[PDB]
Every structure is written in structure tokens, then in C-alpha cells.
């Protein structure tokens, strides 16, 4: 047949790329020499096109003006700290080691100095549970217990924008505007609604997948559609 | 470095080069890894020098063990061009061999002795 939509994606053509030339900044933690002698002042709160959440512009002591992944409760004028000796206050960044157990953090680094990888979406937060000399245990938004190098930096507090998901889009037009700010092809035509040549589920008088939807992990691209390697399906049992 | 198994003090290297220079003026000396190699093989060698900045190292890797199974004493020089200058060459030399000193036999003896002590 013809390559399915999931295969057109990988080519990274315009239709599938994110509007990067419109994105603001890479909200990675600042790189400090050591000591924590780095402080800045929240100079402004801005909208972040790539995450539908707010971001804060900070002016650091040494003269660096950088956008920051802002937690909830940060406002203009407030002073933020980034370093091993930073104060344990919402909005400050420091290694997990320096963080008191039982404190919600966000923008947690995967590997020390990478800039942050976990808990960066609207209103989410990781939960630092255990400390140690070799391993800091964090509970991520998905609820999974993650073991991290205690040298991994994080920001105290939860991410700004919480509850963004509580309000329904109501209209296709609203979904539309948001989708235009992402790297996604939208709207979505059902596989069952296409011709056999276009999808494993296409074809047949009435619409229906002429096959079970749970597909093997080993399936090749073009065939791996439907419920990928499902451990189970439905709501029952 | 892979063929070097002990460092020689700048002082010792100094005396050795000087001894080598008076060896060419008086006695006989071989210039070149090949000639140096045949001397150690024909047994007509008293003291053989081997630069340490030789690249590729294969050119001289064999001198150490070859010299051992032949009693011939050998010493390292930090630089290839000095050995060549001392050997009286307008170029460098990866290795050198004093094919019978000349009014330096005394010195050569001591250097060999000093080296053995240096392991």
C-alpha cells in the first residue's frame, strides 16, 4: 500500500514540525561555578508558546538575562537563587542533596547539569522522598519512583499553570489554535475511515478493523498501529 | 615509552652524550637504527643509545630486549635530535651505538655501571 501517517511524520516535513522559529527559550537551569553566589530578580512574567504555561524573565547578579521555568507563586521583584547554598524557598534551584525530604520540586535534571528534564508541564511536580549519599529518590508526576544522583538540580515548588486541563476545549476551533502552536498534524482521521491502501484498518463495506488491535512490539513500522503491545485493554477485569 | 622501562637523569644523559661525542672523534660509532641493530647482533657494540621521542615506536621497540640477550648495555636519551647532533649528524637519530669507544672507554664503563644500578 502507501506509507501510513505515522511514517510521513518521521520525515520531519513542515506539516509535522513544531513552529520552532516562534518558540521563546530553552528553560534550562543556569550553570553555576559553585558556592551559590548567583541571585537574580524576576523582571517579568511571560507566556511560553511551547508549553501553554507562564515563564519568568530573570536578571542575574552577573548581568545575565534569561527566561526561567517558573513555579506557581513567582512574581516580579522577587529574588531567586541558584546554587548549593540557595535558600529553601519556592522558585530557587539547588541539587536534590540540599533539598529537605518531602518538598515538591520541578524541572528535575536527569543527569547533573543537563538543565532539567522531568516535571516541566503545567501544574505538575515531582516529590522528593528519600535522601542518601548515593541516591535521591523522587516520585515523578506519573507516580513512578525514580532513583536520581543527589547531584541532580531541581526547582522548589510546583510548575505554574495548574488546572489548565480542567476546562474543556468546547470547540474544534480552540483545539485548532493550540495545535498550531505544536509539532502535530491535526485533525485526526480514523484509520478505519481510510482505504485499505492507506492503513491496516482501512477497507471493508462498513467500517471496522478487520483484525485484532493489540499489535506486537516487534511489528515493523507501517504495521504497528492500534493498541501497541497492550498489557491489557478495556475497563473491566 | 612502551620500550622505556626506567627514566634516566638529565645528568647521566649529559655525560653519555659527551662520552658519545668524544667517541666519534676518537673511537668508532654507528649512526642509525639499522647500523646500530647489526652492531648489537654482530656483537661489535659497547654502548647503544636509544632516543625516547621516536614515532612510530616500532622503529626502536626491539633494541632493549635485543641488547639484553646480547649483554650489550644501552641508555635512553630524551631527544632524537641531540643524539644525532652528538653522533655528529646534521639530522636526528633514533638510536646510536659506540662501536668501541676511544679514550672514553673509562667513561662508557661507568655509565654502563650507573645504568645497571638504575635497573
Amino acid at each position: 500500500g502507501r506509507r501510513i501517517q505515522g511514517q510521513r511524520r518521521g520525515r520531519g516535513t513542515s506539516t509535522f514540525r513544531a513552529p520552532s522559529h516562534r518558540y521563546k527559550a530553552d528553560l534550562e537551569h543556569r550553570k553555576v561555578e559553585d558556592g551559590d553566589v548567583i541571585a537574580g530578580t524576576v523582571v517579568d512574567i511571560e507566556h511560553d508558546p511551547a508549553r501553554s504555561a507562564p515563564v519568568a524573565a530573570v536578571e542575574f547578579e552577573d548581568g545575565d538575562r534569561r527566561l526561567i521555568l517558573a513555579p506557581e507563586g513567582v512574581g516580579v521583584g522577587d529574588e531567586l537563587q541558584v546554587g548549593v547554598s540557595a535558600e529553601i524557598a519556592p522558585g530557587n534551584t539547588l541539587p536534590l542533596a540540599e533539598i529537605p525530604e518531602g518538598v515538591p520540586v520541578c524541572n528535575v535534571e536527569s543527569s547533573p547539569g543537563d538543565g532539567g528534564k522531568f516535571a516541566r508541564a503545567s501544574g505538575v511536580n515531582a516529590q522528593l522522598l528519600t535522601h542518601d549519599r548515593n541516591v535521591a529518590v523522587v516520585k515523578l508526576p506519573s507516580g513512578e519512583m525514580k532513583r536520581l544522583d543527589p547531584q541532580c538540580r531541581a526547582t522548589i515548588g510546583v510548575v505554574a499553570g495548574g488546572g489548565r486541563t480542567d476546562k474543556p476545549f468546547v470547540k474544534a476551533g480552540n483545539k485548532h489554535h493550540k495545535m498550531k502552536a505544536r509539532g502535530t498534524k491535526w485533525p485526526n482521521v480514523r484509520g478505519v475511515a481510510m482505504n485499505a491502501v492507506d492503513h491496516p484498518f482501512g477497507g471493508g463495506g462498513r467500517q471496522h478493523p478487520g483484525k485484532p488491535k493489540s499489535i506486537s512490539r516487534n511489528a515493523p513500522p507501517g504495521r504497528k498501529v492500534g493498541d501497541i503491545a497492550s498489557k491489557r485493554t478495556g475497563r473491566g477485569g | 615509552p612502551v620500550y622505556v622501562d626506567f627514566d634516566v637523569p638529565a645528568d647521566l644523559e649529559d655525560d653519555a652524550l659527551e662520552a658519545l661525542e668524544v667517541a666519534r672523534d676518537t673511537g668508532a660509532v654507528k649512526k642509525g637504527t639499522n647500523e646500530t641493530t647489526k652492531s648489537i647482533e654482530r656483537g661489535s657494540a659497547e654502548l647503544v643509545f636509544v632516543a625516547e621521542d621516536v614515532q612510530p615506536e616500532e622503529i626502536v621497540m626491539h633494541i632493549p630486549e635485543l641488547a639484553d640477550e646480547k649483554g650489550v648495555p644501552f641508555i635512553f636519551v630524551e631527544q632524537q635530535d641531540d643524539l644525532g647532533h652528538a653522533a655528529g649528524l646534521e639530522v636526528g637519530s633514533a638510536a646510536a651505538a659506540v662501536t668501541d669507544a676511544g679514550e672514553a672507554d673509562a667513561d662508557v664503563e661507568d655509565i654502563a655501571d650507573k645504568v645497571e644500578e638504575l635497573r
Binding site: - | 646500530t36 641493530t37 622503529i59
Partner: protein, 194 residues
């Protein structure tokens, strides 16, 4: 008596043993950090280079080249093919890696001509060969009795036409009798069946 050269030679018969083993372990670390073609002041296997024609003279150049290891990097058929012409994974190319290396070297030095080449090892993902190239325009070479032949017009781009030692062997021209019915005088003149 044995030449000093015989020692370099003998060392390279078992590149995985002795001092040579340790040298290679060290060297490759640096080679992996170098480009595809790095000119070098002196051959790594002196005995081999001199044996192949190398001379410490103006106009003689040596370069190390690395190539990815393995079979052909072939693209699967987009149009109809009978089972026989659908293979993609086990198909290998007809030129050996040493030859691919000689050609890349010669492309880097457009004015020089390949004289010969030899292997200097490999690791799990690539192979290295050193290539001897000659400057046919330098008088030190135009006046050499052992190398001036490579200055003739018909020797231009010799490597790209299989005129190299590695080229001739890969073309099946080693044997003078049995087995060379379709290789000599050329693969092409024999319909490409050798």
C-alpha cells in the same frame, strides 16, 4: 645479519601480541579522534612502506585513512524484483576496504598519485590503512630512477582505474594460469564475469 626492519615486520605478524598490542591499544584511541584522511610524517610500518616503494624523499607522502567496517550499505529495492534481486543484508560490495581507502586518500590529494598501501589495524567498527602517494610534478621524483615511471600521463588517477597493487589483486589478476580466464586482461573485456 637481520635488518632493523625485519623487527618491525616480525612485530606486525601478530599485532595482537607483545608491545605492538599495547601500542595499538594506545594509538587507536587517538586515531578514532582523527578525521577520515590524516597525512603523517612517517609510515607506521616502515619495513612495509620501503618494501612497497616508499623513500624518505621530497614528493613522497603518507596518509592514514579509516573506513567503516562491514558489508555493503545498500538501499532496498523500491520497484519490482524477483526474490533473487531483493536481498539487502548479506550483499557485499566488489571492492575491498583497502581499495576504498586508497581512493579517498587520492581524492584528498588530487595532485598526487597512489603508489601502494598497507593495513595498520582496525577496531570493532572501522579499518585503517596507510597510503603512499607520490608528487609526479616534483623534480626530486621526476629524477628518481625508481619512481619516475609514475610521472607518465597514463598513470594519472591510476587508483581509480584499478592500476594499484590492491586494485590488481581485487580484480583477480594474481594467477597467471587457471582461474584467470575471465580476469585477464580486464574484467570488462571479459563481459564482467570474473
Amino acid at each position: 645479519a637481520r635488518s632493523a626492519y625485519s623487527y618491525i615486520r616480525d612485530a606486525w605478524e601478530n599485532p595482537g601480541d607483545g608491545q605492538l598490542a599495547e601500542l595499538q591499544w594506545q594509538r587507536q584511541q587517538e586515531w578514532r579522534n582523527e578525521g577520515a584522511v590524516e597525512r603523517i610524517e612517517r609510515p607506521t610500518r616502515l619495513d612495509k612502506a620501503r618494501s612497497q616503494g616508499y623513500k624518505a624523499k621530497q614528493g613522497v607522502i603518507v596518509a592514514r585513512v579509516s573506513v567503516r567496517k562491514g558489508s555493503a550499505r545498500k538501499r532496498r529495492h523500491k520497484a519490482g524484483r524477483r526474490s533473487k534481486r531483493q536481498g539487502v543484508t548479506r550483499i557485499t560490495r566488489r571492492k575491498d576496504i583497502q581499495r576504498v581507502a586508497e581512493e579517498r586518500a587520492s581524492r584528498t590529494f588530487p595532485n598526487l598519485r597512489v603508489l601502494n598501501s598497507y593495513s595498520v589495524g582496525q577496531d570493532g567498527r572501522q579499518k585503517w590503512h596507510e597510503v603512499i602517494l607520490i608528487d609526479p610534478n616534483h623534480p626530486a621524483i621526476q629524477n628518481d630512477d625508481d619512481l619516475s615511471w609514475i610521472c607518465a600521463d597514463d598513470q594519472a588517477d591510476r587508483v581509480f582505474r584499478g592500476l594499484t597493487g590492491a586494485g590488481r589483486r581485487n580484480r583477480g589478476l594474481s594467477g597467471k594460469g587457471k582461474g584467470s580466464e575471465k580476469t585477464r586482461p580486464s574484467l570488462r573485456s571479459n563481459g564482467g564475469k570474473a
